[PDB]
Amino acid sequence: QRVTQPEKLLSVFKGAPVELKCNYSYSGSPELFWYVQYSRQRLQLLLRHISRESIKGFTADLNKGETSFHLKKPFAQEEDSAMYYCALSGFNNAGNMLTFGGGTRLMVKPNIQNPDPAVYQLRDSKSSDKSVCLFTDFDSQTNVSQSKDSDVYITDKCVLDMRSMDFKSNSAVAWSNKSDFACANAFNNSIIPEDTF
Amino acid sequence: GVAQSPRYKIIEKRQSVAFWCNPISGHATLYWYQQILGQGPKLLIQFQNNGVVDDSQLPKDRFSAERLKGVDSTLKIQPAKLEDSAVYLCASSLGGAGGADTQYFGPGTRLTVLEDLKNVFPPEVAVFEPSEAEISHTQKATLVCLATGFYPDHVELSWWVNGKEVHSGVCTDPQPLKEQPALNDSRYALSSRLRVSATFWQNPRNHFRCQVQFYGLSENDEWTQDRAKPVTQIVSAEAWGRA
């Protein structure tokens, strides 16, 4: 009795298809499930193999010829970003229990309507001369690379939703204690040539 | 739903720890799972009423559990090891005489086992004001919050505008970074952004606060160091609208 989710991370574009793979090993007729955990929420049932119903746009077909139970959706939605766990039920294992796969995180990237990449400098609200560099409004083509210098800190990219404005944007933050640190040089990674400084 | 206590717990290696679970009213089956970071839940023990149904995977030299009246249940680790750091999940299901019923999960207990409680630090929090260049170029204004120097990674960051928590326009890093990556006691930093319209930021009556809830040591933990005991606590930074 084993459940395998072969990949820990799946990153897709919004509106692109989703396939979260799950394979099982089980002698007999298996009972299969998908569970989901959204950020700050409890782990919860998503669907079972016994019903064809689409749940939140997802379906999963038990394919015994491939011992697979892949979770699929044709058009990824930003709301689908979450942790997904495949599970298999075992009959009279002392009682009736679940075995879970190792999980896969689904991340759904926004489609930025009009990229406007730029690096701005922000000053501390307290009277220190601390500042941070904000790289923002870049396309989901751009990947942000971690800092190679010990005393420069760079976060990964992060999408915010100004839903009152119907507007989404990526950003990453860079800061450092050093004299030498400048926003013109904060992100010496693959950034857009049209980047505003 | 299923209840669990505590939500976060820090203990030192070789100390003991107990977790509490209250199942759904009338659920005959109760499950305890261990979930290591980046893994799935793995069953520790399962109860049917007050009787152990499956304890084969219980690490019996140090783990034990009871559910003495067939309702709420306690799991204890005595003594704890560093490798026990994990989320401890409780679940319940009806327990009827059919197939596998839906399992309902608690919110989990996050356990961090440390070598030295003197390595525990609360965060410092700073808010950075929007750039004039951004305001001019986009008619939008991004605030940044930095939480720094905390250990272990037990933080919840939120944004508050005029005293009300806000979620629209916010992004917080899903993972903290290590302030000193070549160190396995390294403290952590974490960033978040809040973006508002330029006119909203320009209004001098609007109040902006970044809040960081830290979960640290408990009342009953010993502390003889000079600096303040690193207890569970809120640390915030604030900024006012400007024109």
Author numbering:
A (entry chain D): 1 to 197
B (entry chain E): 1 to 243
Give me lines lifted from the publication on this model:
Here we report crystal structures of one public and one private TCR (YLQ7 and RLQ3, respectively) from COVID-19 CPs in complex with HLA-A*02:01 and two S protein epitopes, corresponding to residues 269–277 (YLQPRTFLL; designated YLQ) and 1000–1008 (RLQSLQTYV; designated RLQ), that were found to elicit almost universal CD8+ T cell responses in HLA-A2*02:01+ CPs but not in healthy donors. Public TCRs are observed in multiple unrelated individuals, whereas private TCRs are distinct between individuals. For its part, the RLQ epitope, unlike YLQ, is conserved across human and zoonotic sarbecoviruses and is therefore a potential candidate for inclusion in a pan-sarbecovirus vaccine. The YLQ epitope has been identified as immunodominant in multiple independent studies, including one involving the BNT162b2 mRNA vaccine.
